Amino acid sequence: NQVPKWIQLNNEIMIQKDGKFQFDKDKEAVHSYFVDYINQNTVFFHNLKEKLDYLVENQYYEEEFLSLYSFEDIKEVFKTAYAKKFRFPSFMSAFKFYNDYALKTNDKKKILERYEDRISIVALFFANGDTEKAKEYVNLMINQEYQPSTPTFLNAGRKLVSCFLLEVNDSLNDISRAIDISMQLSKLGGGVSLNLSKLRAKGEAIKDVENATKGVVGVMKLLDNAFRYADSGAAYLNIFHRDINDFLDTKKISADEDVRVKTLSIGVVIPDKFVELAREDKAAYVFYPHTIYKEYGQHMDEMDMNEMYDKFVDNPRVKKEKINPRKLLEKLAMLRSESGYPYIMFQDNVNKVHANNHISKVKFSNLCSEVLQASQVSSYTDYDEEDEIGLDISCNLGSLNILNVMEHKSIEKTVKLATDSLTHVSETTDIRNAPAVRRANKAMKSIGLGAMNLHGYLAQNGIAYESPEARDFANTFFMMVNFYSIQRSAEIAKEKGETFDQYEGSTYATGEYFDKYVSTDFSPKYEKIANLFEGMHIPTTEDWKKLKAFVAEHGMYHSYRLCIAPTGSISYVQSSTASVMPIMERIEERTYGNSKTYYPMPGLASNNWFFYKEAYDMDMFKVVDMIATIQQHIDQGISFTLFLKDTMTTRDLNRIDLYAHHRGIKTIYYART
Amino acid sequence: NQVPKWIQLNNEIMIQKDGKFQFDKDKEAVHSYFVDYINQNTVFFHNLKEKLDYLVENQYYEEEFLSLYSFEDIKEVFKTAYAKKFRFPSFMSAFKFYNDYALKTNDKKKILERYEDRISIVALFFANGDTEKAKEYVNLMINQEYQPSTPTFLNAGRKELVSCFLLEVNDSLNDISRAIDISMQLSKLGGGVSLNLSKLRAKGEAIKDVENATKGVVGVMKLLDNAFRYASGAAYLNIFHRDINDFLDTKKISADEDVRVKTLSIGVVIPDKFVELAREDKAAYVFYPHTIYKEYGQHMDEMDMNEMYDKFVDNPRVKKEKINPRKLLEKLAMLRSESGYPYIMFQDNVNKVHANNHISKVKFSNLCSEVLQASQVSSYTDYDEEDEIGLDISCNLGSLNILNVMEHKSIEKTVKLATDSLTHVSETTDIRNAPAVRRANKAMKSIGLGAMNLHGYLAQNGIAYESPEARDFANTFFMMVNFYSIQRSAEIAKEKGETFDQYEGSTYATGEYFDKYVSTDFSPKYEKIANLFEGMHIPTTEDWKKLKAFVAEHGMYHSYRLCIAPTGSISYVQSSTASVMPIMERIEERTYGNSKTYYPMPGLASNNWFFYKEAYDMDMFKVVDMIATIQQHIDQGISFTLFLKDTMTTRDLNRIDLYAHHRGIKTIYYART
Ligand SMILES: Nc1ncnc2c1ncn2[C@H]1C[C@H](O)[C@@H](COP(=O)(O)OP(=O)(O)OP(=O)(O)O)O1
Ligand SMILES: Nc1ncnc2c1ncn2[C@H]1C[C@H](O)[C@@H](COP(=O)(O)OP(=O)(O)OP(=O)(O)O)O1
Ligand SMILES: Nc1ncnc2c1ncn2[C@H]1C[C@H](O)[C@@H](COP(=O)(O)OP(=O)(O)OP(=O)(O)O)O1
Ligand SMILES: Nc1ncnc2c1ncn2[C@H]1C[C@H](O)[C@@H](COP(=O)(O)OP(=O)(O)OP(=O)(O)O)O1
């Protein structure tokens, strides 16, 4: 019943020694943890050869790519991995990896893969042919300079993408196909979110008889029962719809028995016209979209609300409904004060900066509220009848540490390797049950790259989070990031000579995206910021012009490059902070079982106590301006999370909302208190 | 606010005039009803021609088959229909037809089709070419000698047609998707759809990689219960299964929130081995059927329990579970004492008399608990992968009056016409979303014929319901019915020369079904019974031998012929009793709205008060013996309904259950109290 030694040592840090914390004990706890639990459950082997032979003959490793080299080259790779003599810096830095991510045995009671093992297996998977490139991947990963995404880091060479985005056309057959594909992807563990734009609303005619449709709530009920069957997503909705009130009455603290969704989140799509009507204090008109489909032939949100709203008001054919926008934003503020639900996307900020609006305009987002790409709906006909295949969105992920990049200045080569890595991942991927995801993943070739560790590095260097210097720093940094990113994409496009489809329809072929960079140079405006990037080259606008010419030579290989995800579950292995959202508390406290695990933030010393500010004690406006400065280079959304208090006000909340709409923040997240 | 005249006249019957009822007022109420509500809402026309032209040009009648004759022949058919000068005998005899079944207008406020109209349209639909045959259908129907089934009587020549669907669910994710798809497809067609969950793996079991991963049968029931709420059937289960207790905990008066099915009924399949184990007071062993599928390759209920039960006990591979059968029948008696749920099928009584056991054995039944045919499961593979098509069951229905048959002695010609009618109906049927139903309905060609009006005719003639004379009467009657039925099937088989597939595999080609009729002649054993059939020919066993030879010449066209359904909703139009179940109460009382509609049973006079017995005051054993005498000629099940009282006993209930198992009653129904 006694608590073991390392947990007891980890509980020692809260003892006040001269008003401080016992940080130096922490390593000792880690030095306990590698003696009394880890090195007494590892399966023992003589050397490498039999080890790998035992790993093959019990159905663990996919033996194909592990047969495509010599034994000696793999031995050199493992030798390069063990030559680091790597150590962990913190207590959770081991515990989150040797409990869940690292490979266990069949009885789930022993440990096979060491920390070099998993990384070097990932390295040979990203190699696909070159030994020295695999060594480059090792030197990239073992210095914690790059982190692949969660399911890629898990399921490399065992028995892959955690983000799926679909559309539901309007038929019975379409709803059947949708529930089919959701149950298919549900066992694959990824993130699956739907959208209910083109559906007819409640109390409407079904092809023969008026007032026959049970509406959106029944489809939500079927999906809520549907995800309860397998190993949880969400759904979005554009606001110009009658049942939007019933779409928002689901998340309710006085929850109805039938109106009860504990699985799917919800979210609202809002263009500028509704914002205008809520500002100027006038009426609003939600519609019956099936009447619009009968009238104009197209669907509702496939046209501009700013161009067509009063024209639909003027049409006697479209049956309408008048409501109050201001009371509706008040109700949104109340429901976000309850939890923070739903999600919010401002599409006009997105499409006016989007490159690929010539295919379609972005209407929705994933569960992770980040990926904003084109989407064409399919049409699933009857059994012997053939179908028509639209386009879908499937985004594999991956971020990186800012800190080690700043330590080593190999940011270019880092992007060079990570781009090829995610390229080979999207090469490898295949799904054999949803054909539109198949066609789009072959077609669009969308990769997603981001970064964590913003708060901690700049807080450890002694720069406040609300400083303008950090905003200029992030501006110059992400400018150079996007620069080398497009540079590598153009290089690979020259290597293959095969861009994505309808490349001339993009703004990339015209250089309209490049028109921001031909002027308005992003040189550092502070000396202390300039000392940080001091020691390496920073490009000029003429370098952007040479880049524009080199793009105009061939083109770009990818259609999308960047994403920012709240990668907290693999934040702990990199032993760092979250992404760009600053930290909540200086000390995290968990109870694994009969235990009080005490996690300090990395870099917690006496001097930098003030730069480790608290999330409840910050200017939200400067945070939004930081995220807007970050937004200057990112194609997709940014995982912006609101940090609130009970003492705050929905007046101030909606002021922050309209402030972010005025700045141009794409999406937000669930709010915390 | 005043009650109209005819309802006030209909409420007059409960006034005691010399201790009697005001029967003679009732016709007066009917004579009121054709003056003050019906003949003041009929759309008025000059004559036939413009009438039909107006009916075409507003999308009511399917104009194809109504273009395949002359105008004059249709005029002769309508003239023959109006030449009857038909009247209704009772008050509900109009009210159940001019309120729901007869055709209304688009605003649902006026009446177009008269009572001749609907019948003669059905007549021309059954004609398909011959005017005189249509006149024969008129002379059949307008004397109330035959009644087609409910959706055929509704949707003839309008804007599917068979109210009975039976499916199977193979074991995959894809199969469950296909099952929910087909259920939602048939749900808008309004028919009866019931499933079966035999071949599914049970709760807490391995899903292909990881032990204890299956949520079990309850989640699939939850999905189906949500599924039918969107657009109502049932499902069956064989008892040798671990989750059978959880399969019976759904219908519970102390209902759980999650375990709550207000839509689907449930039912139990029981062979003789479990009956034996419950009698002899020993243990029982339910199984994990996926282990059996891994062991023997086949599925569980595709083999004999009597041959394999102890062999599965002897296998160490099959994981088992020991339970008490006697306490389980006690729990069944308790749950039937709660409501009467679930349903019960004794398959060994069925298969030992079934002709077509060479294809498969019957495992389940429909919602109406009557149709017991073969069923091969399909296998629904992935998207580009092709599937394999099994066999399904789809049974259109139809019964007849016994009374007018006894009045006119045209029983042979009646069967001659009704067989061709249901034949043409099964010709006409097509569904374009469930391919196995398509293939089976083309293949098996199963028709279903029955009869109502057993209790009332023999009660009006002055013969008690519990008499042996009625049992001999029904024996001789249904013997001759089945005789002429097989005679007409052989005639049509000679007409086409194309029997159903695998006809030589049947017992009909071998005459093993005919071996009962070569001896043991069913001559009437009472003089009073013999006077009823007196005046017409009754066949002999040598006539059965000639029938056997004529069958051996060609064969039989159909694989199934007979069914008995509780056709109460179209009992009222024929102005008669139900089918073979005797009546509950002598007077039915309903409240349409602010009203007390008082329905007397037909033939209610002072003399026959005693022969109109009450259902709570009868010998159940003689009822079961009556149904067993009826069972001597019917291939399918019989809609046997239990009539119980609160003063009765589950001891006596289970005694009746085992009594019916000893007699050989196929299925039972929900019990009433
Ligand atoms: N933080 C850590 N990360 C990884 N391994 C660790 C960590 N802490 C201890 N160990 C491992 C390494 C060794 O196998 C064992 C402890 O030996 P350790 O003292 O840490 O290495 P070392 O040999 O380089 O130092 P020393 O020479 O002082 O013994 O457990
Ligand atoms: N029985 C039903 N109950 C509820 N909703 C239904 C039902 N049947 C169909 N629907 C709903 C969901 C469908 O998306 C929508 C239309 O159904 P569906 O028949 O598949 O469209 P359709 O392609 O045949 O033609 P249309 O565009 O005129 O509706 O109404
Ligand atoms: N039970 C009924 N069934 C059908 N129609 C009826 C019924 N009762 C009354 N009517 C109809 C028939 C007529 O159109 C009208 C009533 O006339 P009705 O007296 O019944 O016929 P009738 O003309 O043969 O008798 P009578 O010569 O004595 O008037 O309503
Ligand atoms: N994620 C899941 N959650 C619950 N049940 C599942 C899940 N995935 C599959 N199943 C259930 C329902 C399926 O009928 C059953 C097996 O699934 P499935 O993969 O379709 O079978 P299979 O044809 O691929 O091979 P096998 O016969 O070995 O199961 O287990």
* Location of each CATH 3.20.70.20 domain in chain A: 145-271+325-673
**Distance in angstroms (rounded) separating the CA atoms of residues A465 and A243:** 42
> How many Å lie between the centroid of ligand 1 and the Cα of residue B614?
91
Helix (H) or strand (E) holding B427: helix B411-428
Report the residue count for chain B.
673
Q: Which two tokens stand for residue B411?
A: 């029983």
**Distance in angstroms (rounded) separating the CA atoms of residues B151 and A393:** 46
DSSP letters spanning B76-132: HHHHHHHTT----SSSHHHHTIIIIIS-B-TTS-SB---HHHHHHHHHHHHHSS-HH
CA of B589: how far to CAs of B11, B91, B190, B579, B647, in Å? 10, 12, 28, 20, 24
Q: Which residue reads 């899903």 in tokens? A: B207
Judge whether B368 counts as a catalytic residue: yes
**Could you tell me which CATH number the domain at A145-271+325-673 has?**
3.20.70.20
> How many Å lie between the centroid of ligand 4 and the Cα of residue B264?
24
Closest residue to atom 19 of ligand 3, CA basis: B31
Burial class (CB in 10 A: 0-12, 13-18, 19+), B450: buried
Closest residue to atom 21 of ligand 4, CA basis: B172
Cβ-proximal residues to B231 (8 Å cutoff; 6+ apart), any chain: B184, B187, B188
Q: Which two tokens stand for residue B396?
A: 């259109």
**Distance in angstroms (rounded) separating the CA atoms of residues A287 and B222:** 34
Interface test with A, best of B383, B387, B433, B439 (most A CBs within 10 A): B383
Range A541-546, long-range pairs (CB < 8 A, 24+ positions):
A541/A517, A543/A483, A544/A483, A544/A514, A544/A517, A544/A518, A545/A518
A230 CB within 6 A, ligand 4: yes
**Distance in angstroms (rounded) separating the CA atoms of residues A571 and A561:** 21
Distance from CA of B378 to the nearest CA of A (A): 15
Instruction: Out of A179, A208, A435, name the one closest to residue B180 (CB).
Output: A179
Q: How far is C-alpha A362 from the geometric centre of its chain's CA atoms?
A: 16
Peptide bond connecting A4 to the previous residue in cis, omega within 30 degrees of 0: no
A30 CB within 6 A, ligand 1: yes
**Distance in angstroms (rounded) separating the CA atoms of residues B473 and B534:** 12
Contact A222 B222 (CB under 8 A): no
CA of B491: how far to CAs of A241, B442, B511, in Å? 62, 20, 17
Q: Which two tokens stand for residue A269?
A: 């799509």
Model resolution, angstroms: 4.7
CA of A652: how far to CAs of A620, A640, A647, in Å? 10, 17, 11
DSSP secondary structure code for residue B265 in this structure? B
Cβ-proximal residues to B408 (8 Å cutoff; 6+ apart), any chain: B143, B145
**Distance in angstroms (rounded) separating the CA atoms of residues B4 and B483:** 51
Ligand nearest to the backbone CA of A201: 2
CA of A1: how far to CAs of A33, A109, A464, A593, A652, in Å? 18, 20, 46, 12, 51
DSSP letters spanning B204-224: T---SSSSS----HHHHHHHH
Helix (H) or strand (E) holding A475: helix A468-496
From B6, B31, B575, mutation site for ligand 3 pocket: most ligand atoms within 8 A of C-beta: B31
Phi and psi, residue B423, nearest 5° = -65, -50
Residue B89: how many other CB atoms lie within 10 Å = 15
Residue B48: how many other CB atoms lie within 10 Å = 13
From B40, B87, B97, B115, mutation site for ligand 3 pocket: most ligand atoms within 8 A of C-beta: B87
Residue B101: how many other CB atoms lie within 10 Å = 16
Q: Which two tokens stand for residue A371?
A: 């990926």
Helices (H), A142-253: 150-154, 172-186, 216-227, 244-248
Contact B177 A187 (CB under 8 A): no
End-to-end alpha carbon distance in chain B: 36
Ligand nearest to the backbone CA of B169: 4
Residues B249, B253, B257: CA angle, nearest 5 degrees: 70
Ligand nearest to the backbone CA of B95: 3
Peptide bond connecting A539 to the previous residue in cis, omega within 30 degrees of 0: no
From A32, A34, A38, A86, mutation site for ligand 1 pocket: most ligand atoms within 8 A of C-beta: A34
Helix axes A172-186, A216-227, angle to 10 degrees: 20
For residues B271 and B347, is the Cβ–Cβ distance under 8 A? yes
Phi and psi, residue B370, nearest 5° = -130, -40
**Distance in angstroms (rounded) separating the CA atoms of residues A488 and A415:** 8
For residues A485 and A415, is the Cβ–Cβ distance under 8 A? yes
Contact A229 B209 (CB under 8 A): no
DSSP letters spanning B626-657: HHHHHHTS-SS-B----B--TTS-HHHHHHHH
Contact A433 B223 (CB under 8 A): no
Burial class (CB in 10 A: 0-12, 13-18, 19+), B166: buried
Contact A222 B226 (CB under 8 A): yes
Residues A340, A345, A351: CA angle, nearest 5 degrees: 165
Distance from CA of B162 to the nearest CA of A (A): 20
Q: Which two tokens stand for residue A337?
A: 């004060």
Alpha carbons within 13 A on the beta-carbon side of B221: 30
Which residues on neighbouring strands pair with residue B195, listed in sequence order?
A: B235
